[PDB]
Structure formats: C-alpha cells, structure tokens
Amino acid sequence: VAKKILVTCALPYANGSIHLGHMLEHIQADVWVRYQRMRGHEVNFICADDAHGTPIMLKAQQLGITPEQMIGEMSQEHQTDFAGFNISYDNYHSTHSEENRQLSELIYSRLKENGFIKNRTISQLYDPEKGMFLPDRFVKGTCPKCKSPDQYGDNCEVCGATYSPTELIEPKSVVSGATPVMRDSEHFFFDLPSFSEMLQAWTRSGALQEQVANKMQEWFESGLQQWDISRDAPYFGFEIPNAPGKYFYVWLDAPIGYMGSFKNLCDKRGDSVSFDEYWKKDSTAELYHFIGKDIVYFHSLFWPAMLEGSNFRKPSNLFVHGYVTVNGAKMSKSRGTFIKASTWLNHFDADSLRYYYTAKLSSRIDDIDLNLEDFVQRVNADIVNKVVNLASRNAGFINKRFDGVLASELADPALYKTFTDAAEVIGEAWESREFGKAVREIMALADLANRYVDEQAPWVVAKQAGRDADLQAICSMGINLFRVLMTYLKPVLPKLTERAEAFLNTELTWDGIQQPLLGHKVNPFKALYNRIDMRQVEALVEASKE
Ligand SMILES: [Zn+2]
C-alpha cells in the first residue's frame, strides 16, 4: 500500500565545507526519495548539521566569534549547497537545538533508569593553564623515536611511529603552549555489551547489505565495548542532567539529531501525532539511514542499542555507500581534485553530477570514481545525444507544421508497450538502489527510441508530398517515447525534468506513462540541455587548485 518513510543522510560536521565526496550520499538518498514520492508514499527526508564539540568551540574562540555564530554561518552555507544540488530535504536542522537537548536528556534518562549507564574514572592529558582536558591531537611534541619536532597526536608524520601523547618529548598543549599533565575525571559510559544478543538477532533478521552483515560478524567476534558518552567543561554542547560540568559527547547527541530534526519538522507543521508514529517501539513506519562505510559500526551497533535501551524503534535498514575518488585516486588538494560543492556549481549544473553518480551507483558498498574525462563524454553522449536529442529532433516538425499538436494515435503501439513494460524493471532498480542498472535500462530504451526515429527518417518524410499525417505520427511517437524516458529519469534530473515538463505541457507521473499524449499541444521547443567541453573541466580543476 502507501508506506510511511523517514529517510536521513549522515549529519555534516559544522566545521567544514561540503565537497563532492559528501554529495554522493545526499544525491543517492535524494534520487531514492524522489522515486518513493513518485510512487505515492509518505516520505520525510531529514538531515541536520552536527554542530557540537571541542573542535567547534576552539575554532570559534580562535576566530573571535561565538560558536553559535560560527555554526550558524556554516549551517547556511551547507543548506545553500544542498539546495543548489536540489536535495529535496523536508527539513534541515541542527544538533544545537532545543529539540536535540530535550531528546538527549530524555534518552539519557531512560538509559540511566534502565541501568545502561556506567560510571568510570579515566586519566587524560590536561591543560592546567586553560583548564581543559586535551584530545590526543591537541598535544604537540618531539617524536620519541626519531626525535623530529612538532609532531602532533599519537603518531609521527616523519618516521611514522605511533605512541601515546604521553611519550612525546617535551609535550606542549596546542591550545595554550602550556605543558600538559595527567588528570582524573569521572566519565559516563553506555553499556553496549548488554545489547549484543539483541543486536545479533537483529542483524540476522535479513536486512543489511551482505557486506554490512559480514563486517558485523567480525565486530561481534571481537566483542563489544562500553562507549564513553561524556565530556568535561569547557565544552560546546548540552550538559548532562545531574552531572554538573559534564556534557554529552557526540556519540550520543549527534544521532539524536535525526530525531530532533524530525520533531522540529512535526512542530513546524503543527503535527502532534507523527513523531510518536514514526519513533515509537511498535512503529509500522520505515526508517532508513543513508551512511558512509566509515560510520557503519556506529549506526549498526551503538545507535540501535541506544534506541532499544530508551524504548524507541530501531532503523528498518542502513543503506551504505563507498567513497568517491576522482580520476581513480583519493581527492587531492594539490591536483585540484578536492572539489567543493559550491565550486562545482560555479562551473556545471547539478543535473550533470547527479546523472554521473547515479549511473555508477549500486546497492553495493563499492567506491565511486568520478573520472572527469569520462564525465564529459557520458553527459554529452547520454543526456544530450540520447535523451534530449529525442525531443529536439521531433519538436521542430510538430511545432512548425502542426501547430504543436500531437497525433491522435500511436504510430507504433507495440514499441510504446515495450517502453511502459520496462517500468517494472526500472522501478524495482530504483527501489533496490541498483541505480546503475536503472540507467542502463533507460539508456537501452533511449537507443531504441533513437533507432526508431532513424528508421523513420522524418527529415526525409518531411520532403515527400502528401505525407503530412505520417510526419505527425512519427514525430509524435518520438515525443511520447521521450515523455516515458523523462519519467524514468525524473528522480535523477530534477531541473531537466522541469524544463521537459514545461515543453510537454504536462507533469510527469509514474502511472501517467500508461496514457500517451494524444491530440495534445506541446510548447515551442527550447534547448533543454547543452554539451559541455573538456575546457570547462580544466577550468574547474584549476579553480579548485587555487
Ligand atoms: Zn618519528
């Protein structure tokens, strides 16, 4: 029937700009969400900025502005980039909100009551001048192995040795320049180990990608550990109830952002029933998290345990994707392959990237390679020469010789059925996240549509006397095939689809393809998409280098 679906994307860190690596996740989720909406389901697409943490607090101080101001600006920047790529979020919030505070306290309270919170005193390097414990990377020093100066954290970039910051020669606090010292502090831990049996049964209930369920097996074998969920002041975040000086570490408050953002959305809509409908233990609504492979452990073990422990429903499934490489290698700042979302939009449109990523995506966790050379060729070849060409080639004749009126019947009903029959396969491909497959199927159909037009040679029929009817039937057949193709691609290319709809004078819906456009008036044709040059790509890389 009509499902209730809540989809999220991992929360971007407020202390950084969105790059093409991040876009892969958001575009993958958006394509899936747009398809689900097209099928009539109730979909809620949610996200938010991860805005707490010592790093955030320090960068803000270093800059002279308040963290509240810093994260506020980063939030607008991120939202501008996502809007630019047409990521159709129903709501984009922040972990730094009243909703998140309330939910973090509620969940913490329940976990504590149920006895899943443990106290443990730990020892950590402390900056006595600033009065704050120091995370490993905030301690500078001389490597005890090779004696190289200015080595940070727990590893040396020179000899590559690893060690505890307490082994550094002349340790110095990066925050004040003071010499750190050891110091004790009581911390709160989440008893993840007490959920192992439940998590095992849950993971075995056939949900996760084969590759995910397999990594989980190794994690169980190794054994689960308790996780620290507290931090000491000074800190930028929410204070733990009944624990003055203690704050919620990100492990806890970041994923709550998924809930906080949804609650914020319900409040905005004046909806007092949905939150519980979606998050209560016996919910029949579906919850999906689109995440990267680097945060699977957290979302598959810690997150569901926390939810279970606080009496909330667990995710229905986790959709994991791999990383993005450019030209076969990790993004490179020196090579100008480290491309930011905002930079990309200064040179190309969002539809091009959305199409390329989609054509390469699948239900597997494999890495996605953005080959710039291949990108230009794929876009020009597929979008411009196969799909858009189908419309432009036939639009002229219809607009100039028939007043934009399409024929009253299908020239080839059998060929049309071939295109609508494919809906089943393409729809299941979109649904199962086999995007590359959906695109292959669609392009196969596009080749077919172009072959039909080639064989009918309208530019030839257009020259023969007493063949006006034939010309109209042929060109109208081509426009109707284009109608179907654009429908299958609607989830992928939002802007191109709008321009297509303006031309066809119709809104494209999934079920609408069963009813071809007959005796229908299309609008004067206008370039739907233009070819891109390799020079455009070179300018982007140069711009990224700089
Ligand atoms: Zn060294």
Swiss-Prot record:
Short motif ('HIGH' region): ranges: 12-22
The record's free-text note on cofactor binding: Binds 1 zinc ion per subunit.
Top-level division of the source organism's lineage: Bacteria
Subunit structure: Homodimer.
UniProt catalytic activity: tRNA(Met) + L-methionine + ATP = L-methionyl-tRNA(Met) + AMP + diphosphate
Function description: Is required not only for elongation of protein synthesis but also for the initiation of all mRNA translation through initiator tRNA(fMet) aminoacylation.
An individual GO BP term: methionyl-tRNA aminoacylation
Subcellular location as annotated: Cytoplasm
Binding site for ATP: 333
Gene: metG
UniProt GO molecular function: ATP binding; methionine-tRNA ligase activity; protein homodimerization activity; tRNA binding; zinc ion binding
EC code(s) of this entry: 6.1.1.10
Family of this protein: Belongs to the class-I aminoacyl-tRNA synthetase family. MetG type 1 subfamily.
Sorted UniProt keywords: Aminoacyl-tRNA synthetase, ATP-binding, Cytoplasm, Ligase, Metal-binding, Nucleotide-binding, Protein biosynthesis, RNA-binding, tRNA-binding, Zinc
Section of the entire sequence shown: 4 to 549 of 677
Primary residence: cytoplasm
Cofactor names: Zn(2+)
Binding site for Zn(2+): 143, 146, 156, 159
Motif mapping: 'KMSKS' region: 330-334
Protein name (record): Methionine--tRNA ligase
GO cellular component, one term: cytosol
